[PDB]
Amino acid sequence: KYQEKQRKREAEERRRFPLEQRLKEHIIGQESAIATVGAAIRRKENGWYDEEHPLVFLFLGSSGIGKTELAKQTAKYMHKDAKKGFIRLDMSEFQERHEVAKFIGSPPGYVGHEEGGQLTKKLKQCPNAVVLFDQVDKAHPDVLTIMLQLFDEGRLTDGKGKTIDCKDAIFIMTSNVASDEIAQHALQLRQEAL
Amino acid sequence: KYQEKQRKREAEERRRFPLEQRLKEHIIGQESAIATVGAAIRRKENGWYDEEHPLVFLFLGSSGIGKTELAKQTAKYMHKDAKKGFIRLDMSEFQERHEVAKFIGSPPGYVGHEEGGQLTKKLKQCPNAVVLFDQVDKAHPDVLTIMLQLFDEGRLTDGKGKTIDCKDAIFIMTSNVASDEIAQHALQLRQEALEMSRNRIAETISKNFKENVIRPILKAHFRRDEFLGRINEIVYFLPFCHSELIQLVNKELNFWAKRAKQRHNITLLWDREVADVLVDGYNVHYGARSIKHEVERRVVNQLAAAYEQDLLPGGCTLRITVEPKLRLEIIDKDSKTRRLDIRA
Amino acid sequence: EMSRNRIAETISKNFKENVIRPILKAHFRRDEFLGRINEIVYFLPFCHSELIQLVNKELNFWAKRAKQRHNITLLWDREVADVLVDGYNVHYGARSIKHEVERRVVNQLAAAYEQDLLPGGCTLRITVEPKLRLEIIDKDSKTRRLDIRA
Ligand SMILES: Nc1ncnc2c1ncn2[C@@H]1O[C@H](COP(=O)(O)OP(=O)(O)OP(O)(O)=S)[C@@H](O)[C@H]1O
Ligand SMILES: Nc1ncnc2c1ncn2[C@@H]1O[C@H](COP(=O)(O)OP(=O)(O)OP(O)(O)=S)[C@@H](O)[C@H]1O
Ligand SMILES: [Mg+2]
Ligand SMILES: [Mg+2]
């Protein structure tokens, strides 16, 4: 009964000042994006999410219109100022195919094997973290192939064979792909609306 | 006599509810794949398998059509919830030649040598495990060269020299190689079947496609004919027909109805028109995941918004209805079916 | 070609030294390593007679298992081997014949054994209907195809 009362109090607190208003304090425009991200996170926090499959976003748009800002404020909403629950990874570092060792660490018998992976350590520290694969369109596509197991099922085995359950995470992928097409279509729709 | 009686009882249990029906509970469509995998595992469990060479599958097809799901349910059939007997290995981690150390440890005089290999340890723990090399094509082909010894004879010598017998294992290899070709050929065959059906009303992947189209594509990607020769059954997962899409939407809506009834006690209901509306969100490339995401967008977000607003009390009948926008409708009597005002 | 022309009326050293020797030197990268090898032995693909022999070998293996374990006298015709040769692939070799025998013949045997259509001691016969079909033979020439349900 105490846990149910605490859950009801947390639900009332979320209903008082939800993620939509909290993003509207920091984000201007992007009402469709705030609505989509808030609806998905509302589905997650209320327990209406498939626990087997983690939540995954791909923020598309032009430059400097709040993709990384909405991802950061999403991570701040879920985990407050705790730095453990915001696993930033700027994917412009991941341009070559062989940059997956940063994700998963080195195999046995190679330099950096004892240090293990970086993302797998950060997800061991916080399984439900908001991972922000920022600038995802700058990495190799073969490097993004590692995210298949991490997105469908929330698992990523390190170099030492230790798999980490990342099912409660919220993966976000900022991208400038189709930025010109989205911008031209939005300007065309706004001119037609005018 | 007791062992023979237990074997006969296990055989009667398998005949009562075989792997085909147990897969058809979860998997929808893919009757060729379920038939192939079921016939192979029936050959294995009834003792009609060569004990020297392990059984090796290659699951080919488009994205999100039950390759990894059928592999997981195959492993659950063979070993129940025992995690030892399901050695998952996401092969997208193996994108470089030097990633075979995860399989076979490290040599003497190097870091990680005492820990030994990971797959060889897991196969020492369970020799007859269902090893799922998920997304095998995303690994380096030189990394797949280690699987030759492990597929032809079931052996994988670690860094410490300790060989492990893996002959009873059921290796499964999910891959999206020739996914576009399999999808286009299946859609072409369905179009030809519909053409012949309407022509008659007016009054199966062929081996040539496997040998002429898919075999060169596999030989190009895997780069080794011996690796493809070791595979016992290259299974072909086809895209979903429209009936299979309606069945997938009904499966997802039944999943959310079960969650709503168990957790929150909300008898969630819907019409056939709801499934027909949600089928329009199906993307051929993404497969069943598009239906799951469409159900999460259209249906489940409304359920979460109504639950957060305390509009779905316990014990309420909640019918989804097409207005095409889906709209919830809490029910109290026969005529009383009020729509819920889900504020922003 | 020469045989049919005459009726109408081995790897050569040059191939080893010209074709195979550069490929070996390219892969192994060391003429000393190849010079230490006493005998580079060449295994050739299977002729059609050798494919029928391989199919007979695999069917004899499954016949030995059926007789030893379950006491089932498995039998087959030359047409059965001729049908199963079509599953041969030159790229995969004898493994293709093993997989074809396991697909066509032995899945049906396992389905019949699970369904108790193969008691201890029965002259079972594979037969071309081309689909292979089992035919349990009773005493005398009485035969019947097994109704292997799904
Ligand atoms: N809609 C917005 N409302 C308020 N501040 C914004 C908004 N969009 C961007 N900013 C500011 O822009 C700066 C960084 O912008 P980002 O958050 O990087 O946007 P973005 O779309 O990632 O594009 P990039 O350059 O292509 S990676 C921050 O200081 C934010 O304050
Ligand atoms: N035929 C199906 N019947 C029921 N559920 C399915 C089916 N196909 C896929 N799913 C669901 O889809 C989700 C994952 O699908 P997978 O098992 O990844 O399929 P897949 O074909 O491996 O493709 P990938 O993306 O290329 S690795 C799971 O939650 C399954 O429930
Ligand atoms: Mg950014
Ligand atoms: Mg998969």
B321 in Cβ contact with B272 (< 8 Å): no
Nearest CA among C145, C112, C124 for reference residue C71: C124
Q: Residues near A24 by Cβ (< 8 Å), separated by ≥ 6?
A: A34
| B47 interfaces chain C, CB cutoff of 8 Å | yes
Give me the residue label for tokens 């016992």. Answer: B232
Nearest chain A residue to B121 by CA: give it: A161
Q: What is the DSSP string of B270-288?
A: --HHHHHHHHTT--TTTTH
Would you give the DSSP letter of residue A159?
Answer: T
Q: What's the angle, vertex CA C10, arms to CA C8 and CA C16, rounded to 5?
A: 135
Nearest chain C residue to B230 by CA: give it: C95
Strand-strand pairing, B88-90 and B316-322: unpaired
Q: Is B257 left (phi over 0), alpha (psi -120 to 50) or beta?
A: alpha
- Token pair, residue C140, equals 């005398």
Helices (H), chain B: 2-16, 19-26, 31-45, 67-79, 101-104, 119-125, 141-144, 147-152, 179-202, 207-209, 215-222, 225-230, 242-259, 272-279, 288-295, 301-308
Helices A67-79 & A31-45 angle (0-180, nearest 10): 30
Neighbours of C34 (CB within 10 A): 14
CA dihedral over C15, C17, C20, C22, signed as positive or negative: negative
C125 in Cβ contact with B259 (< 8 Å): no
> How far is residue B321's CA from residue B272's CA, in Å, rounded to a whole number?
10
The four Cα atoms A42, A45, A51, A56 give a dihedral, to 10 degrees, of 50
> How far is residue B164's CA from residue B153's CA, in Å, rounded to a whole number?
11
| B343 interfaces chain A, CB cutoff of 8 Å | no
The greatest distance separating any two alpha carbons of chain C, rounded to the nearest whole angstrom, comes to: 68
B287 in Cβ contact with B64 (< 8 Å): yes
A108 in Cβ contact with B159 (< 8 Å): yes
Q: Residue B322 belongs to what H/E stretch?
A: strand B316-322
Q: Assign C143 to helix, strand or coil.
A: strand
A158-to-A106, A124, A126, B5 alpha-carbon distances in Å: 8, 11, 16, 46
Q: Is C48 exposed, middle or buried (0-12, 13-18, 19+ CB in 10 A)?
A: exposed
Strand-strand pairing, B337-339 and B326-331: antiparallel
Q: Is B102 in contact with A114 (Cβ distance < 8 A)?
A: no
Q: How many residues would you count in chain A?
A: 194
> How far is residue C54's CA from residue C38's CA, in Å, rounded to a whole number?
30
> How far is residue C132's CA from residue C117's CA, in Å, rounded to a whole number?
17
Report the separation in Å between the CA atom of A134 and the middle of ligand 3, taken as the mean of its atom positions. Answer: 6
Report phi then psi at C50, rounded to 5. -70, -30
Q: Residue A60 belongs to what H/E stretch?
A: strand A55-60
| A29 interfaces chain B, CB cutoff of 8 Å | no
Nearest CA among B275, B277, B242 for reference residue B256: B275
Q: What is the 3-state secondary structure (H, E, C) of C38-100?
A: CCCCCCCCCCHHHHHHHHHHHHHHHHHHHHHHHCCEEECCHHHHHHHHHHCECCCEHHHHHHH
Strand-strand pairing, B170-175 and B326-331: unpaired
Would you give the DSSP letter of residue C150?
Answer: -
- Token pair, residue A82, equals 């705790």
Strand-strand pairing, B132-134 and B170-175: parallel
Strand-pairing partners, residue C92, are none
Strand-strand pairing, B55-61 and B170-175: parallel
Resolution of this entry, Å: 2.8
> How far is residue A110's CA from residue A113's CA, in Å, rounded to a whole number?
6
| Rg (alpha carbons) of chain C, rounded to whole number | 22
- Token pair, residue C8, equals 């109408």
| B114 interfaces chain A, CB cutoff of 8 Å | no
Neighbours of A128 (CB within 10 A): 17
A94 in Cβ contact with A192 (< 8 Å): no
> How far is residue B92's CA from residue C38's CA, in Å, rounded to a whole number?
42
Nearest CA among A79, A83, A8 for reference residue A46: A8
Q: Is C103 in contact with B233 (Cβ distance < 8 A)?
A: yes
The four Cα atoms C83, C87, C90, C92 give a dihedral, to 10 degrees, of -140
All chains having 3 or more CB pairs closer than 8 angstroms to chain C: B
> How far is residue B260's CA from residue B213's CA, in Å, rounded to a whole number?
46
Q: Is B229 in contact with C95 (Cβ distance < 8 A)?
A: yes
Q: In what order do the strands lie in the sheet with B316-322?
A: B266-269, B316-322, B326-331, B337-339
> How far is residue C145's CA from residue B233's CA, in Å, rounded to a whole number?
26
Q: Of A34, A69, A76, which is best to mutate to test ligand 1, by the most ligand atoms within 8 angstroms of its C-beta?
A: A69
Backbone interruptions in chain A following residues (C to N > 2.5 Å): none
Neighbours of A18 (CB within 10 A): 18
Give me the residue label for tokens 């069945």. Answer: B247
Would you give the DSSP letter of residue A90?
Answer: E
Q: Residues near B256 by Cβ (< 8 Å), separated by ≥ 6?
A: A48, B268, B295, B299, B300, B303
Q: Measured between CB atoms, which of C89, C91, C107 is closest to B39?
A: C107
| A157 interfaces chain B, CB cutoff of 8 Å | yes
A160 in Cβ contact with A113 (< 8 Å): yes
Atom of ligand 1 nearest to the CA of A69: 17
Q: What is the 3-state secondary structure (H, E, C) of B181-232?
A: HHHHHHHHHHHHHHHHHHHHHHCCCCHHHHHHHHHHHHHHHHCCHHHHHHCC
Q: Residues near C19 by Cβ (< 8 Å), separated by ≥ 6?
A: none
Nearest CA among C93, C24, C45, C100 for reference residue B152: C93
Q: Is B121 exposed, middle or buried (0-12, 13-18, 19+ CB in 10 A)?
A: middle
Q: Is B50 in contact with C61 (Cβ distance < 8 A)?
A: yes
Report the separation in Å between the CA atom of A38 and the middle of ligand 3, taken as the mean of its atom positions. Answer: 19
| B228 interfaces chain C, CB cutoff of 8 Å | yes
Q: Assign A139 to helix, strand or coil.
A: coil
Going by alpha carbons, the residue nearest to atom 24 of ligand 2 is: B63
B148-182: b (≥16 Cβ within 10 Å) or e: ebbbbebbbebbbeeebebbebbbbbbbbbbbeeb
A and C touching (3 or more beta-carbon pairs closer than 8 Å): no
Which residues 54-83 of A are in CB contact (within 8 Å) with B? none
C62 in Cβ contact with C105 (< 8 Å): yes
Q: Residues near B188 by Cβ (< 8 Å), separated by ≥ 6?
A: none
A61 lines ligand 1 (CB under 6 A): yes
Neighbours of A142 (CB within 10 A): 17
A87 in Cβ contact with A123 (< 8 Å): yes
Residues of C marked as binding for ATP? 36, 95
> How far is residue B317's CA from residue A191's CA, in Å, rounded to a whole number?
45
All chains having 3 or more CB pairs closer than 8 angstroms to chain A: B
A85 lines ligand 1 (CB under 6 A): no
Distance from CA of C150 to the nearest CA of B (A): 9
Which CB contacts under 8 angstroms, 24+ apart, belong to B216-220?
B217/B177, B217/B178, B217/B181, B218/B177, B218/B178, B219/C91
Q: Is B263 in contact with A109 (Cβ distance < 8 A)?
A: no
Q: In what order do the strands lie in the sheet with B233-237?
A: B88-90, B132-134, B170-175, B55-61, B233-237
Half-sphere exposure of A142 (CA within 13 A, CB side): 16
Q: Measured between CB atoms, which of A109, A146, A163 is closest to B106?
A: A109
Q: Which residues of B touch A149 (CB under 8 A)?
A: 90, 92-93, 134-135
Distance from CA of B223 to the nearest CA of A (A): 18
B29 lines ligand 2 (CB under 6 A): yes
| C96 interfaces chain B, CB cutoff of 8 Å | yes
A117-to-A40, A135, A163, B134, C40 alpha-carbon distances in Å: 29, 20, 11, 20, 45
Would you give the DSSP letter of residue C124?
Answer: E
| C29 interfaces chain B, CB cutoff of 8 Å | no
Q: Assign B180 to helix, strand or coil.
A: helix
- Token pair, residue B239, equals 């895209």
Q: Assign C18 to helix, strand or coil.
A: helix
> How far is residue A99's CA from residue A91's CA, in Å, rounded to a whole number?
10
Report the separation in Å between the CA atom of C90 and the middle of ligand 2, taken as the mean of its atom positions. Answer: 34
